[PDB]
Amino acid sequence: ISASRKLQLKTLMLQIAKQEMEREAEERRGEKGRVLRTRCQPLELDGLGFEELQDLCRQLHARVDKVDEERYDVEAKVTKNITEIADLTQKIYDLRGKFKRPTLRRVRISADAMMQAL
Amino acid sequence: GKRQTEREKKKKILAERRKALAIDHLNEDQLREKAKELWQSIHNLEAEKFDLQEKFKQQKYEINVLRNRINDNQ
Amino acid sequence: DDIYKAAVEQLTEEQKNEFKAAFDIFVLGAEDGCISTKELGKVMRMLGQNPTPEELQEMIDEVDEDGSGTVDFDEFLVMMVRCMKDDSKGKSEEELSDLFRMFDKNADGYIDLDELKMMLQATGETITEDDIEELMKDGDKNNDGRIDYDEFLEFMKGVE
Amino acid sequence: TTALVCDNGSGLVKAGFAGDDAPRAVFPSIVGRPRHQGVMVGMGQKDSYVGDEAQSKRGILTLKYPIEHGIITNWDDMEKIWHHTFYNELRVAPEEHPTLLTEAPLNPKANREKMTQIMFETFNVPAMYVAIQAVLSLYASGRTTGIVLDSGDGVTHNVPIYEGYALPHAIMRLDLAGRDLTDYLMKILTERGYSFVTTAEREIVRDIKEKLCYVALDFENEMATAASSSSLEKSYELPDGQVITIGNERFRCPETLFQPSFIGMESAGIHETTYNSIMKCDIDIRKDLYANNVLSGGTTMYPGIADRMQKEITALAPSTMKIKIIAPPERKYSVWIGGSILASLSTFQQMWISKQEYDEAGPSIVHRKCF
Amino acid sequence: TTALVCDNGSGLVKAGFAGDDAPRAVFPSIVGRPRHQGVMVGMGQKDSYVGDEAQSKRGILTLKYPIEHGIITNWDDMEKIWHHTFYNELRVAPEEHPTLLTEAPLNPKANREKMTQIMFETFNVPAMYVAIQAVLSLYASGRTTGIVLDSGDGVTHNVPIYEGYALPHAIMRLDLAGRDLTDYLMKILTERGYSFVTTAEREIVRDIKEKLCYVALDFENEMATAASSSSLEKSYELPDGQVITIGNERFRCPETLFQPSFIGMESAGIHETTYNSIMKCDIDIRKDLYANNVLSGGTTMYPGIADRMQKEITALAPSTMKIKIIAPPERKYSVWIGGSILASLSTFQQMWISKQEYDEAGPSIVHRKCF
């Protein structure tokens, strides 16, 4: 039953978890950039007619509408999820308080100070 | 009550979301410039949409975690 | 190790004077200068606060790694301030939640023996057979065969 | 995506994703507000415990079922039950899943229309479909003919089907079910001294009924035997001690099914409404219905009912026909298994009531072609 | 600021700031005017010594408790006691501190209303709240269920609580307590020759009771043993010499708790009023109450009571249930520790009866929502 080695393992696993979280965040960023480049195709329109200008502009406006619709939907989803998260966090906090607050107090604050006053 | 209230809300949001759309009636160079600007705007919009997807996934997982925690009380 | 030397380095002569005044009773004379750890049980009680005796034994056996049975004023100082709270803020609650999400990369909401076992094996640390079961008790507090959020939180409670 | 096969029932809500063998979450459908005052502060006391949580705190609650006899009498509580079922027992938001509710035959229209309106407005599902609780139980048996007696906890109904063509003029719905048997058992227990009155103690009487009662093969012989020997008296330990001994109350409680005159009901038992339901059918499909009588529903789980019913029908029916009673071991969840099978079919995938259709015709769409 | 957790009690006033472990000042609640004439001039003789000062000059005083059985019978003396408690034992002016009094269950309304009127008009506190003496003792144990038997010095009451919901119809308040045991001990000491009559000598008999008496595990066996051997006779030195020897009066004084017929009271002992209080509760929370029986109050400090009570209840209760009696070593101050915990809560911070509310509704505000 070792004790200090337990603390050593705790710190080591904490550092390893930090490194893994950092590398996973980097992987997420790289994959997100890759997907953004893939889905948002680059277009070149040098030396084109104004009719093609109108067609491409209208297509871009329609894509803008669709993307804003998706953003509105996912924004509503995220707001609802945030509301649920706040509610559940409040509930769990209330449960933890009910479990622990009776166990917190000022122990031996002044009783030991009563030596010879009487 | 989400039968006309939510639909009208999102319809109004879409209507106000649309900005001015009057371009192709101008000279070619600046129109191309603004088309590239709007391409970049769509690029940023898609990036933000992906970020929102990931955030929603993480918050859903945290919701599952909180549900597990509240279920474990008994 | 010397990490707690750095931790105790913050306290300058201001606490050293008080600690020497307290320790003067330990050096009561008629000795060869070995200065054992016998009085430490009540020396750590000079102000009233006293931790569990098991932690006191861990502190006693941990320090003086040379086995000389000599309590250096440096060791005495760092062990006496060890009675006072000493922690590096224990990461952050959101940081701890992220760390546990990384721990629960299986997305199951629970960690079994295999999960944390592979987690520590990825660290490459040599772990004994006398261990693991100790870690099993540390993690599976409810004895339900897994690690929950509360069990992880107490397991990682304020550790930094 | 996958479909949600919910099954409201009356007494136990059974739900789960389509394509599995058993419902994922099964829990009583009761919503109980606390009734005492409450003095501890900050205990985190909620205003209504629903589902299986209120079967553990039932000592200080007043449980009340939101579904009386198939029909739904308290819409707010039913909405609460559905919300719990979706969010806490399955943890899947309904915005991304079709739903397949179930409904007893011959129920009021307003109940079904309100059900679809709730599912489309509050929970905002993509598409929902309502199915008769007996056709599913026929699916689960892997048959395509047969007359199914689905004796649930709210209402007992008997739908005959041949070659996939249901016979709407031969459905015999009777309102005696498990709940009335619980009340009658609670009423005859008073003949020994045990008085259960509180709505919480109805659950204890239900447990007694489930664990001890059985259906007698012959009623008079059992009544004579239990009155002479003492080989039947089985004891049971209440939630606090003080064991009780049930004598001939064991087979008298479920006997009400075959003699509804015990609880004052006029109609004939479940042994004779099946024969009447058969005789209303055409003369050429009676042999097949005789040979493929199907049992389902919870209340048909009494030990020894598949023999009593066969004996009774053989007494009633002509001597030449063969009487066979299909009693699968998975009787309780038969309706839900059938619901899963139906929702997993490819041919059925275009029968859902899509949301745009509801927006165009209102809640009265359910009575239309999309049944 | 910090709250003042006062606890009037009857026999010992316990007070202290909220958030500590033990009351700051504990002193008997007696006010004794001198009774003789007094010949020395300029000695600085006061007209009434209160609190612990009158336990040192009790030789020439006539001590009289201002609280008989929970209720307060002499309001001027109680006001004097409160004034002493605030100004001399704590030295904090009440103009800057909320107060949390405690009151026994089922007490007269006028007592509580007069208490709040005094606290708001004479001492002029910012806000005061009155709490039932048993809920606090349940707080201190860190539980949330359980049936607490708070046998104080004035009155013994038995409040069952489940999941934070108090059961108002199951409170059994009995007026036998430490004071009646003191009187009965003083009455049975006369069987050996020792006569204590003066109100000052009641304190000596109380000290004898505290230091020597104990509760017998089995009464008849102890009565037989004390009548043959002499291993029980413990001696005690009066405040002037002349040691006395207490024989079988040792376990006969506190036996009155379990047989109130000794002092002529009709009711059943504290071993049977707890079982009756449990049996009035619902049938599904009786196991939890059986397993979490809590003892509190001063009079439950007799050596050997936590075993006698458990034996008695196990005799009464069904054989299957487990009977456990929680007897923390800090029994005497359990109510005050619970009061400190309750006053230290953040959720409770808005339940105080603010002074402007009292100005708008009068003293009858205490019976209203702010309980």
Ligand SMILES: Nc1ncnc2c1ncn2[C@@H]1O[C@H](COP(=O)(O)OP(=O)(O)O)[C@@H](O)[C@H]1O
């Ligand atoms: N093993 C059993 N033995 C006897 N009766 C049972 C058994 N299981 C359930 N029941 C009865 O059946 C009822 C449950 O029926 P169920 O099929 O769940 O109704 P629903 O059709 O509403 O789902 C219970 O109320 C109970 O009275």
Ligand SMILES: Nc1ncnc2c1ncn2[C@@H]1O[C@H](COP(=O)(O)OP(=O)(O)O)[C@@H](O)[C@H]1O
């Ligand atoms: N150690 C003890 N042993 C036996 N009886 C005691 C002991 N301490 C106190 N008592 C009895 O309890 C009474 C004090 O009870 P207490 O809890 O102070 O009442 P209150 O509820 O009014 O505060 C005293 O009158 C005394 O008779």
Ligand SMILES: [Mg+2]
């Ligand atoms: Mg059913």
Ligand SMILES: [Mg+2]
């Ligand atoms: Mg008291």
